[PDB]
Design an enzyme around this catalytic site. Structure first.
Site, mmCIF file in Angstrom:
data_model
loop_
_atom_site.group_PDB
_atom_site.id
_atom_site.type_symbol
_atom_site.label_atom_id
_atom_site.label_comp_id
_atom_site.label_asym_id
_atom_site.label_seq_id
_atom_site.Cartn_x
_atom_site.Cartn_y
_atom_site.Cartn_z
ATOM 1 N N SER A 62 34.984 36.510 -102.367
ATOM 2 C CA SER A 62 35.721 37.662 -101.862
ATOM 3 C C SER A 62 35.802 37.777 -100.344
ATOM 4 O O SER A 62 34.992 37.208 -99.608
ATOM 5 C CB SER A 62 35.115 38.946 -102.437
ATOM 6 O OG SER A 62 35.026 38.873 -103.851
HETATM 7 C C1 LIG Z 1 36.078 35.075 -107.903
HETATM 8 S S1 LIG Z 1 34.364 35.298 -108.159
HETATM 9 C C2 LIG Z 1 33.826 36.748 -107.178
HETATM 10 C C3 LIG Z 1 32.768 36.661 -106.149
HETATM 11 C C4 LIG Z 1 31.336 36.287 -106.203
HETATM 12 N N1 LIG Z 1 30.730 37.548 -106.441
HETATM 13 C C5 LIG Z 1 30.696 35.645 -104.989
HETATM 14 O O1 LIG Z 1 29.767 36.204 -104.324
HETATM 15 O O2 LIG Z 1 31.118 34.524 -104.653
HETATM 16 C C6 LIG Z 1 33.850 35.971 -109.692
HETATM 17 C C7 LIG Z 1 33.766 35.287 -111.001
HETATM 18 O O3 LIG Z 1 33.384 35.805 -112.170
HETATM 19 C C8 LIG Z 1 33.465 34.793 -113.105
HETATM 20 N N2 LIG Z 1 33.588 35.822 -114.101
HETATM 21 C C9 LIG Z 1 34.645 36.076 -114.927
HETATM 22 N N3 LIG Z 1 34.528 36.428 -116.190
HETATM 23 C C10 LIG Z 1 33.227 36.414 -116.262
HETATM 24 C C11 LIG Z 1 32.335 36.719 -117.389
HETATM 25 N N4 LIG Z 1 32.759 37.089 -118.605
HETATM 26 N N5 LIG Z 1 30.974 36.640 -117.245
HETATM 27 C C12 LIG Z 1 30.502 36.262 -116.010
HETATM 28 N N6 LIG Z 1 31.214 35.959 -114.899
HETATM 29 C C13 LIG Z 1 32.596 36.037 -115.016
HETATM 30 C C14 LIG Z 1 34.374 33.724 -112.613
HETATM 31 O O4 LIG Z 1 34.180 32.526 -113.251
HETATM 32 C C15 LIG Z 1 34.174 33.813 -111.037
HETATM 33 O O5 LIG Z 1 33.348 32.904 -110.388
#
Ligand SMILES: C[S@@+](CC[C@H](N)C(=O)[O-])CC1O[C@@H](n2cnc3c(N)ncnc32)[C@H](O)[C@@H]1O
Length: 215
Positions: A62
């Site tokens: 993000s």
């Molecule tokens: C785009 S990232 C956001 C940032 C992250 N918090 C960081 O510090 O880098 C968030 C994500 O959540 C995952 N996400 C989506 N659905 C999910 C689920 N059901 N359980 C766990 N994580 C999930 C994705 O694979 C992805 O890496």
């Protein structure tokens, strides 16, 4: 790294001037763990720019202001038990751990990113962050209930398991709306007077894929 940190300090100063970073706890966390520590070498030159950046498996880390906004809403205190849904690069979890000074639980559904995050955290010397492979839309019962649950992926609606896993008086921060666009950042508080919700504006996170998320 010295040059990268200089640019990062300017970014933090900017966020403070913009009124994005408003507490010393968030400022200190940001200064301790610069974003360049969470991205692949080819993107470190852009880590100080307030924009989201790519990470493996088609996800992203993000934008600094979004991470700051969510942490300020969380109003984290030492000792709190926090669950992050969507580890990604592990950056946000590291920041959370610096503020709560205790074990932080974060869940990621993509194995490649679980490894990516673990490596970044280990490299940075973070020990209190615990990365779990799984479907975070189901939360993480083993360590529930939580003071705050921070979801970094967009959901079509509020996952019931996440509300159930909140301590009384706890809060869930989560984007709710369409698949990868048109989402509203929600602050959901679980009180004796019922579930209270505050809308915080439009956002566009990657989708939360899971049993209580998107298919
Ligand atoms: C785009 S990232 C956001 C940032 C992250 N918090 C960081 O510090 O880098 C968030 C994500 O959540 C995952 N996400 C989506 N659905 C999910 C689920 N059901 N359980 C766990 N994580 C999930 C994705 O694979 C992805 O890496």
């Amino acid at each position: 790294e010295k040059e990268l940190y200089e640019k990062w300090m300017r970014t933090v100063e900017m966020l403070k001037a913009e009124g994005i970073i408003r507490s010393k706890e968030v400022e200190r966390a940001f200064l301790k763990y610069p974003r360049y520590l969470s991205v692949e070498d080819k993107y470190k030159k852009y880590a100080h720019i307030d924009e989201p950046l790519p990470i493996p498996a088609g996800q992203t880390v993000s934008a600094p202001h979004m991470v700051a906004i969510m942490l300020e809403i969380a109003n984290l205190k030492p000792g709190m038990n926090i669950l992050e849904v969507g580890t990604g690069s592990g950056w946000n979890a590291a920041l959370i751990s610096e503020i709560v000074k205790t074990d932080v639980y974060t869940i990621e559904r993509i194995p490649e990113l679980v490894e990516f995050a673990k490596r970044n955290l280990e490299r940075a010397g973070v020990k209190n962050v615990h990365v779990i492979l799984g479907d975070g839309s189901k939360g993480f019962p083993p360590k529930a209930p939580y003071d705050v649950i921070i979801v970094t992926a967009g959901a079509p609606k509020i996952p019931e398991p996440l509300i159930e896993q909140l301590k009384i008086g706890g809060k869930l921060i989560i984007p709710v709306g369409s698949y990868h666009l048109w989402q509203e950042l929600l602050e959901v508080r679980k009180t004796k007077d019922g579930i209270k919700i505050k809308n915080h504006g439009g956002v566009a996170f990657v989708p939360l894929i899971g049993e209580y998320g998107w298919k």
